[PDB]
C-alpha positions as protocol buffer text, in pm:
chain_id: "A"
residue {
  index: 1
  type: UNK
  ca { x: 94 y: 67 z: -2765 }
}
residue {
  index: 2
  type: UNK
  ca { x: 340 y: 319 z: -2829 }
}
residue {
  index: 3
  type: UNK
  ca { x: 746 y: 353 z: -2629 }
}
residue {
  index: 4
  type: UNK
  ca { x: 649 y: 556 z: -2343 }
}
residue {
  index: 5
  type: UNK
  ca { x: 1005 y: 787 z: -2266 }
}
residue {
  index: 6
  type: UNK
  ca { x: 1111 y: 572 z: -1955 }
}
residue {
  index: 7
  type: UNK
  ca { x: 802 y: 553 z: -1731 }
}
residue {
  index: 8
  type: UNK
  ca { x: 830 y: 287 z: -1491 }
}
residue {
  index: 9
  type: UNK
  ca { x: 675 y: 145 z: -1174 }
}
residue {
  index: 10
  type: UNK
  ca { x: 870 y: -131 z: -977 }
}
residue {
  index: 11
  type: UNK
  ca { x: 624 y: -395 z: -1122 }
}
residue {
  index: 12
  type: UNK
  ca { x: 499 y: -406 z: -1463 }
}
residue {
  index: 13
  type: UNK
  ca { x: 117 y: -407 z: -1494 }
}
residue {
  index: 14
  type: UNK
  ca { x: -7 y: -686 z: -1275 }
}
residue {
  index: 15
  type: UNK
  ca { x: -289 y: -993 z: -1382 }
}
residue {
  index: 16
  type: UNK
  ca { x: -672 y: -955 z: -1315 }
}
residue {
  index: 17
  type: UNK
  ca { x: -693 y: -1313 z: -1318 }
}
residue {
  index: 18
  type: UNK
  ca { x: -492 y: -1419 z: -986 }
}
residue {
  index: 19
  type: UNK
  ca { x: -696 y: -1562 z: -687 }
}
residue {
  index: 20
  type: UNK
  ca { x: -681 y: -1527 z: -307 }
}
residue {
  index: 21
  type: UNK
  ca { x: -673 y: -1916 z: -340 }
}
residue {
  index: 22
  type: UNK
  ca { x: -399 y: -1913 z: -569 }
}
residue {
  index: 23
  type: UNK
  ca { x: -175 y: -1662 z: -408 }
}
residue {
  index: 24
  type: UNK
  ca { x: 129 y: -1686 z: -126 }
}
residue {
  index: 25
  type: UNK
  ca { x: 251 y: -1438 z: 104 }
}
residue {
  index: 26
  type: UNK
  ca { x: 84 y: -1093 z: -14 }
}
residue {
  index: 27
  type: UNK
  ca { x: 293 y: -785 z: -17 }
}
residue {
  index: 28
  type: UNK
  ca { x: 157 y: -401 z: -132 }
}
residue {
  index: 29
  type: UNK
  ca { x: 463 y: -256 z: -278 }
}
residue {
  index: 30
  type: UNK
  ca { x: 483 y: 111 z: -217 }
}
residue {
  index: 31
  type: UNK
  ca { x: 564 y: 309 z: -507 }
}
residue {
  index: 32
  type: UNK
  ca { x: 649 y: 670 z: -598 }
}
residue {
  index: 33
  type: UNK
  ca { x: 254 y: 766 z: -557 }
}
residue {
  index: 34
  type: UNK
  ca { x: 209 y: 477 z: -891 }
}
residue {
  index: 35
  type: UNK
  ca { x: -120 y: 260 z: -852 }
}
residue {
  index: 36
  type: UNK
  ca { x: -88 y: 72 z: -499 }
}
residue {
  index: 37
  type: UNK
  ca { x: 92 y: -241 z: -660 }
}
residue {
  index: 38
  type: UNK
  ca { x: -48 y: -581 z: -499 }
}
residue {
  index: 39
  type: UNK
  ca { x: 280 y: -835 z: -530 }
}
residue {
  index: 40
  type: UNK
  ca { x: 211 y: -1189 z: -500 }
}
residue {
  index: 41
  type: UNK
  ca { x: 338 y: -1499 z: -529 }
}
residue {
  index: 42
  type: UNK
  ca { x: 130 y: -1772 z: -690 }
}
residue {
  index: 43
  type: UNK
  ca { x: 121 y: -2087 z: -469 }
}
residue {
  index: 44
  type: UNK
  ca { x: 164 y: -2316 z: -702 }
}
residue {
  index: 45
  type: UNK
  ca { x: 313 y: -2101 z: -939 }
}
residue {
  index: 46
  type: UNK
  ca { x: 596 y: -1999 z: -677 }
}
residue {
  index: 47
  type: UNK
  ca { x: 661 y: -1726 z: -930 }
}
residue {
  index: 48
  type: UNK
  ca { x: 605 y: -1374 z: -808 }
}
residue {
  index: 49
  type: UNK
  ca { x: 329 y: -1144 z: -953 }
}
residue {
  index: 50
  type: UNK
  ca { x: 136 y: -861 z: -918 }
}
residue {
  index: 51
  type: UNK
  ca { x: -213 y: -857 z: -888 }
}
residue {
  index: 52
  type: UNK
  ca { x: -463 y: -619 z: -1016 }
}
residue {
  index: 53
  type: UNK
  ca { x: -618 y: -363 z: -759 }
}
residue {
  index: 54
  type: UNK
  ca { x: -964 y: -357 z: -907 }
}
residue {
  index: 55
  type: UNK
  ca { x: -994 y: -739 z: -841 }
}
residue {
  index: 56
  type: UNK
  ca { x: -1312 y: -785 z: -627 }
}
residue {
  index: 57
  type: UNK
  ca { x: -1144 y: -991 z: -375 }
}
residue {
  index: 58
  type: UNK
  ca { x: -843 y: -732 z: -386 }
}
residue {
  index: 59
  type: UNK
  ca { x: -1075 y: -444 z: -339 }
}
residue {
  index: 60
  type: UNK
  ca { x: -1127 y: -592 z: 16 }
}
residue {
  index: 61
  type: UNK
  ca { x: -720 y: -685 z: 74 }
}
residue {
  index: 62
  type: UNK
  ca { x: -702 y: -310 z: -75 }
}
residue {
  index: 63
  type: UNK
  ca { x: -871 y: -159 z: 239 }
}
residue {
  index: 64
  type: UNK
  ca { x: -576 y: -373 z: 433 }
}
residue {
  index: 65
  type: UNK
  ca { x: -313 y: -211 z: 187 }
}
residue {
  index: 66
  type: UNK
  ca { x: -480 y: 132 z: 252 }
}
residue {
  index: 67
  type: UNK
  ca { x: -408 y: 57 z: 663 }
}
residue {
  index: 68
  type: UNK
  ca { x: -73 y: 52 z: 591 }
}
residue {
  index: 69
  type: UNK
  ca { x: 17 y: 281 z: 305 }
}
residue {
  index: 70
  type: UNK
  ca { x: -113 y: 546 z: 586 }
}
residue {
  index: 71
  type: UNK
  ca { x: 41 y: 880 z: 623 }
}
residue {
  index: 72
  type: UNK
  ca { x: -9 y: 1147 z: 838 }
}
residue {
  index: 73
  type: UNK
  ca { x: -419 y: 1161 z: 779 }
}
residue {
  index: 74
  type: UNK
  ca { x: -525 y: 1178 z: 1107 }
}
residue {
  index: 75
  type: UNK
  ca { x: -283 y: 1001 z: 1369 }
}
residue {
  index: 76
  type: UNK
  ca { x: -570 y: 1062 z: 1594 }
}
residue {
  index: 77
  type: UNK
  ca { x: -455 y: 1355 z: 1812 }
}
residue {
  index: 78
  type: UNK
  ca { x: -207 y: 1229 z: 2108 }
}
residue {
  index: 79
  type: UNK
  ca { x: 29 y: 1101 z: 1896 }
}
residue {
  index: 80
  type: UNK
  ca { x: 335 y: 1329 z: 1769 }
}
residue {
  index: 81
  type: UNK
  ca { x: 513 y: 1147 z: 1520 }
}
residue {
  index: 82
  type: UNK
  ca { x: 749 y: 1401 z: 1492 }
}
residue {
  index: 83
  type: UNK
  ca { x: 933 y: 1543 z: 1183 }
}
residue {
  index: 84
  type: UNK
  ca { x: 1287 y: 1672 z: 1047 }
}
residue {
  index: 85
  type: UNK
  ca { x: 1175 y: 2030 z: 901 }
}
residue {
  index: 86
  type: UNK
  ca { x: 910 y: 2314 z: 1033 }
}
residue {
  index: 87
  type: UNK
  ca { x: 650 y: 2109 z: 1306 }
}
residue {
  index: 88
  type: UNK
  ca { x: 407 y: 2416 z: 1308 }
}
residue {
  index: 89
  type: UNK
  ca { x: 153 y: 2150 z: 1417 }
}
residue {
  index: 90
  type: UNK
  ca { x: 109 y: 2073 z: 1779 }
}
residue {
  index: 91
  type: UNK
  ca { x: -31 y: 1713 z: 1928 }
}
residue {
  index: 92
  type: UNK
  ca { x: 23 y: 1718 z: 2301 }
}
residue {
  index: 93
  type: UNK
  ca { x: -146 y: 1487 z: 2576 }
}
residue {
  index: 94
  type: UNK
  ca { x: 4 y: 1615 z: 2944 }
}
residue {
  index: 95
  type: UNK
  ca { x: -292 y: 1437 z: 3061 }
}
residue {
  index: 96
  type: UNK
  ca { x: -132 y: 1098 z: 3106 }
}
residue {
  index: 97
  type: UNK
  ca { x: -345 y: 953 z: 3389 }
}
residue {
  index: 98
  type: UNK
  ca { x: -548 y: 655 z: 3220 }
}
């Protein structure tokens, strides 16, 4: 492969060979908009990695990664985050009764 200029993701490119069995604490490492990057550590490696997305069993923790790399998508309808520039959008729910 050729020097790329100075293209870099916080982790390098990550190991389509790690297991859910095999891995510690799991942690999806949210990049500049880079591929979703899956860090691991190995449990009995100790040594942190990164594990490929397109793993079968990491498709599944992907969905999990995807709740929580969530932006605003929906937010349902009630809920007005609220932001720093413009808010043109309007979420209101003055019926608070329950």
């Amino acid at each position: 492969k050729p020097v790329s200029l100075s293209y870099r993701c916080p982790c390098r490119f990550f190991e389509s060979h790690i297991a859910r069995a095999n891995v510690k604490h799991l942690k999806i490492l949210n990049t500049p908009n880079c591929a979703l990057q899956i860090v691991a550590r190995l449990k009995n490696n100790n040594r942190q990695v990164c594990i490929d997305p397109k793993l079968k069993w990491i498709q599944e923790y992907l969905e999990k990664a995807l709740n929580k790399g969530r932006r605003e998508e929906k937010v349902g309808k009630k809920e007005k985050i609220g932001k720093k520039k413009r808010q043109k959008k309007r979420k209101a729910a003055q019926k608070r009764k329950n």
